[PDB]
Amino acid sequence: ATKVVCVLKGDGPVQGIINFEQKESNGPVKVWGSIKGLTEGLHGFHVHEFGDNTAGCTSAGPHFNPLSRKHGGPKDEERHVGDLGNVTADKDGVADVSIEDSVISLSGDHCIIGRTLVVHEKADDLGKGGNEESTKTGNAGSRLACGVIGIAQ
Amino acid sequence: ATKVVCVLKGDGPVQGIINFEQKESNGPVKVWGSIKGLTEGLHGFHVHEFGDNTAGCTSAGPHFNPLSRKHGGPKDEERHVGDLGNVTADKDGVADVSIEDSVISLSGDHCIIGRTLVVHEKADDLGKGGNEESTKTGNAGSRLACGVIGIAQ
Numbered sequence: 001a002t003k004v005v006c007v008l009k010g011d012g013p014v015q016g017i018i019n020f021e022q023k024e025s026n027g028p029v030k031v032w033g034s035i036k037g038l039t040e041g042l043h044g045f046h047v048h049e050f051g052d053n054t055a056g057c058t059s060a061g062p063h064f065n066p067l068s069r070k071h072g073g074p075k076d077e078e079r080h081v082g083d084l085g086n087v088t089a090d091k092d093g094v095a096d097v098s099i100e101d102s103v104i105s106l107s108g109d110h111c112i113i114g115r116t117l118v119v120h121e122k123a124d125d126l127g128k129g130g131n132e133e134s135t136k137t138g139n140a141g142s143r144l145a146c147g148v149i150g151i152a153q
Numbered sequence: 154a155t156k157v158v159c160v161l162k163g164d165g166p167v168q169g170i171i172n173f174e175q176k177e178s179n180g181p182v183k184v185w186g187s188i189k190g191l192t193e194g195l196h197g198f199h200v201h202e203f204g205d206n207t208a209g210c211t212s213a214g215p216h217f218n219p220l221s222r223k224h225g226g227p228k229d230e231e232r233h234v235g236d237l238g239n240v241t242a243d244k245d246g247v248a249d250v251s252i253e254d255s256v257i258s259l260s261g262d263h264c265i266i267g268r269t270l271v272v273h274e275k276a277d278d279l280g281k282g283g284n285e286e287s288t289k290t291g292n293a294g295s296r297l298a299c300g301v302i303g304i305a306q
């Protein structure tokens with residue numbers, strides 16, 4: 001198994017730890033952990049292209065999209081590699097993350113190591129929002145916290 | 154060319170931006186940038202094995218050592234892949250980093266993407282300290298600042 005991790009931090013109260021694990025080459029990736037300091041509801045959750053935090057979350061660039069597709073949800077064929085949909089915060093502002101994804105990987109051309117994980121201000125509309133920004137960013141608004149995705153023990 | 158970047162931060166006021174560039178797969182890596190908030194003199198400068206900063210710089214583990222060698226200086230054949238020697242801070246506490254290295258890489262099994270860069274409290278003795286710890290850590294002491302090494306545009 002391959003293990004990777006991401007510590008999410010930003011300019012305000014949002015902080016988290018996200019773990020990724022892949023048992024076999026090209027098998028599904030389990031994603032789990034916790035984020036706190038969020039507003040109750042859905043928050044877009046994406047792997048962005050650059051592991052560049054030099055100017056905070058903005059230097060991470062657009063969604064990680066090695067296959068030049070449009071934006072969608074994680075259960076869509078038409079999606080960016082980095083499209084992990086939304087995490088859900090409760091009334092205590094805590095999101096307990098538990099995702100299994102078959103498109104991201106921890107090896108090869110789909111590999112997310114050295115990229116940035118971002119948790120967003122608003123819901124990702126999963127490309128079903130009916131403006132043109134829906135098919136690019138999912139309208140999830142500003143970047144609340146992020147981190148570079150790193151190799152774990 | 155491949156470009157990667159690292160933002161150094163820690164428990165104190167040491168902060169830095171380090172850029173890495175590699176023109177060809179088989180080529181040297183140029184390393185440049187700036188670190189501020191250091192004591193005047195030499196600070197050990199290493200790539201550590203894990204890109205795991207969940208509990209700060211200690212979760213990065215030992216020096217990145219894929220070839221199971223002893224600790225040395227960057228000019229030594231007997232070195233860890235992660236052994237980049239020392240940076241030098243001036244009277245103003247600023248290190249202007251300028252390194253070229255042919256052992257680290259931005260591709261292959263010597264790849265440093267998703268690992269952690271660490272600037273240390275003390276001088277790395279480059280394996281010439283006269284104790285057993287010299288051949289393992291170089292006696293560079295605690296971890297002042299670190300970051301995960303990520304893919305840049």
Ligand SMILES: *[Se]c1ccccc1C(=O)NCc1cccc(Cl)c1
Pocket residue numbers: 002003106107108111112113114151152261262264266267
């Ligand atoms: Se998967 C990936 C993505 C970007 C850059 C490098 C890599 C990678 O495969 N690195 C090699 C490696 C060695 C040992 C453990 C791991 Cl998880 C990855």
Ligand SMILES: *[Se]c1ccccc1C(=O)NCc1cccc(Cl)c1
Pocket residue numbers: 108109111155156259260261262264265266304
């Ligand atoms: Se860094 C590394 C080590 C071993 C095998 C592959 C790689 C690698 O660089 N892979 C991922 C990748 C894809 C596109 C751009 C970059 Cl910088 C890295």
Ligand SMILES: [Cl-]
Pocket residue numbers: 062063137
């Ligand atoms: Cl975005």
Ligand SMILES: [Cl-]
Pocket residue numbers: 215216290294
């Ligand atoms: Cl050490």
Ligand SMILES: [Zn+2]
Pocket residue numbers: 044046048063118120140
């Ligand atoms: Zn995003």
Ligand SMILES: [Zn+2]
Pocket residue numbers: 046063070071072079080082083136137
């Ligand atoms: Zn997307």
Ligand SMILES: [Zn+2]
Pocket residue numbers: 199216223224225232233235236289290291
């Ligand atoms: Zn070493």
